[PDB]
Amino acid sequence: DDKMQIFVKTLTGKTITLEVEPSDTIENVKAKIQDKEGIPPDQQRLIFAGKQLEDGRTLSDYNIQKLSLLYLVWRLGVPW
């Protein structure tokens, strides 16, 4: 439908697939990573082309189209 596929390489070295919409907010994409991988949104650092993405933007604000590769790291040191 209106959904595309993107890839996220996680801090653990796992290249996962994610189903998203270009209009999803970074916040929505974090929530999907929570569901698939259990990382709390508050902890996630989503990266695309060397930039850490911000919660009020959309994938499309970053020219993030189908089959894009993002990086997900997260904080270490704080509770979950």
């Binding site: 990266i47 990086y71 040191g77 704080v78 509770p79």
Partner: protein
Amino acid sequence: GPGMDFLRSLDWTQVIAGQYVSNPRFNISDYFEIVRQPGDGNCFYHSIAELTMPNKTDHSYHYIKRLTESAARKYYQEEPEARLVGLSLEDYLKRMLSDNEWGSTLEASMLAKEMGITIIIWTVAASDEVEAGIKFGDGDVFTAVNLLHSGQTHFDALRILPQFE
């Protein structure tokens, strides 16, 4: 060696400016001595003090926290991970400097710059098996300040074992 070969073959990916990730697979204690640190909430700074300060005691971490202050005043506003804190510079410092408040990869990034060192955090499962390393700075494992991270909030210090120096 094969140990040295292994440590020399770590594959680091720069995910954002000056921050690198790798996913070697290994028992942390096969290559490092663990220097255990208290579980008082200050362990991040204890671990750093153990590796950077002579005659380290249970109160040396306060010095690391003060270096974190001066680091923050230069670097907090532009640190990507600071965005996740969501506090002004001054409110961050007040929280960061309070007693027994967890340190993290955010302070590691800033201390790397402030102390002119490379910091690696190896994050392990409860089996002490490595799930990833995150490196702040451009140095290698043999000269870096190596920290062991476990159980969400706990850090210990690491020293490479003599046979691999």
